[PDB]
Design a protein around this ligand. Structure first.
Ligand SMILES: CCN1CCN(C(=O)Nc2cc(-c3cn(C4CCOCC4)c4cnccc34)ccn2)CC1
Length: 345
């Protein structure tokens, strides 16, 4: 048993800052309360008294490992907010960044609840399709911003919790984290994406480009509408098997290049790639998207039968776009410039 002291009693046992409600930092920020928690540190509600506006401050952990990755986050956010378009307004704003009590603190604008909270407020019955489209148009517009040849940034951690609403009355969304993010060509890590939204490329261990965020986005949109994660795998092997359930066995010309192909599959004498031997999963390809989305049934789960805009022809556009995002081959996966012009918008 250890009751040591951690950073003069300002830090906890886990490199975080022991947030106390009502603190007045420096002589400017009034820490209201805790907002969110994560591997990076914490997020707090605070009032920037000098500018009389509300801000969300990201208290990075007090460890050189987390403080070095957060500095790459500052550089990317600073680099993104410098470029003059009207798309950088789909990315959360980094107002300023300062060191306080050995924690690197990032001052963000205040956004509202995350897409998962929006999903929980609907008791996981899913948002309407037209609203699912709105998030799709915005995310694809935002994924284009990161694919700017001067940026070339991969988020690597796309998930509902990292897409926040601007106002609690819906529609306007922004991306928020960018801690586990690297620019193309400056890659570093191979265990990058959140399991539910990991691409087959990272699962097989092959080199990845910006196309991995499109895979996550596809899995995000279907989850937003259905209420359940599409590929709700409990571990890496359960993940790849739950992907081949829908999209079938990956192309042989990928597994032949895949370093970690042996982990899930095995090459037969025929040359045909097949799953490893052992029943737990439906035979590859039988869990079709046609039924997950319920195009010709009554929407997902029969809960969208007899509503506006949930046309059978509308779903066929949605189903086509999703399978265009989940193309297993990143060199043929849909790109945001071509995704926005899809017949779904
Ligand atoms: C009316 C009350 N309501 C308003 C405030 N609200 C917010 O969520 N505000 C907020 C959060 C972030 C923000 C959240 N995460 C985490 C991501 C992982 O999941 C946990 C949160 C960030 C990571 N990296 C940078 C910024 C963030 C940024 C701006 N504003 C909740 C409470």
């Amino acid at each position: 048993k250890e009751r040591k002291v951690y950073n003069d009693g300002y830090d906890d046992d886990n490199y975080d800052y022991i947030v106390k409600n009502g603190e007045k930092w420096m002589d400017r920020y009034e820490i209201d309360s805790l907002i969110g928690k994560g591997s990076f540190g914490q997020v707090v509600k605070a009032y920037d008294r000098v500018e009389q506006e509300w801000v969300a401050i990201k208290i990075i952990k007090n460890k050189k490992a987390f403080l070095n990755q957060a500095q790459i986050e500052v550089r990317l956010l600073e680099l993104m907010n410098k470029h003059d378009t009207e798309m950088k307004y789909y990315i959360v704003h980094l107002k300023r960044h300062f060191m306080f009590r050995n924690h690197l603190c990032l001052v963000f604008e205040m956004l509202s609840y995350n897409l998962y909270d929006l999903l929980r407020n609907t008791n996981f019955r899913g948002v309407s399709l037209n609203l699912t489209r709105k998030f799709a148009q915005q995310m694809c517009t935002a994924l284009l911003f990161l694919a700017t040849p001067e940026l070339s940034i991969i988020h690597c951690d796309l998930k509902p919790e990292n897409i926040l609403l601007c106002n609690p009355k819906r529609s306007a969304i922004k991306i928020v984290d960018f801690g586990s993010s690297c620019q193309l060509g400056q890659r570093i890590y191979q265990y990058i994406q959140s399991r539910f939204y990991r691409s087959p490329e990272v699962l097989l261990g092959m080199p990845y480009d910006l196309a991995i965020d499109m895979w996550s986005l596809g899995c995000i949109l279907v989850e937003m509408h259905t209420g359940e994660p599409l590929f709700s795998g409990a571990n890496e092997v359960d993940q790849m098997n739950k992907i081949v359930e829908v999209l079938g066995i990956p192309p042989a010309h990928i597994l032949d290049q895949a370093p970690k192909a042996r982990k899930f599959f095995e090459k037969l004498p025929d040359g045909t790639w097949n799953l490893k031997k052992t029943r737990e999963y439906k035979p590859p390809g039988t869990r079709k998207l046609h039924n997950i989305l319920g195009v010709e049934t009554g929407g997902p789960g029969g809960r969208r039968a007899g509503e506006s805009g949930h046309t059978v022809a509308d779903y066929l556009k949605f189903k086509d776009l999703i399978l265009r995002m989940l193309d297993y081959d990143p060199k043929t996966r849909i790109q945001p410039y071509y995704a926005l012009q899809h017949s779904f918008f």
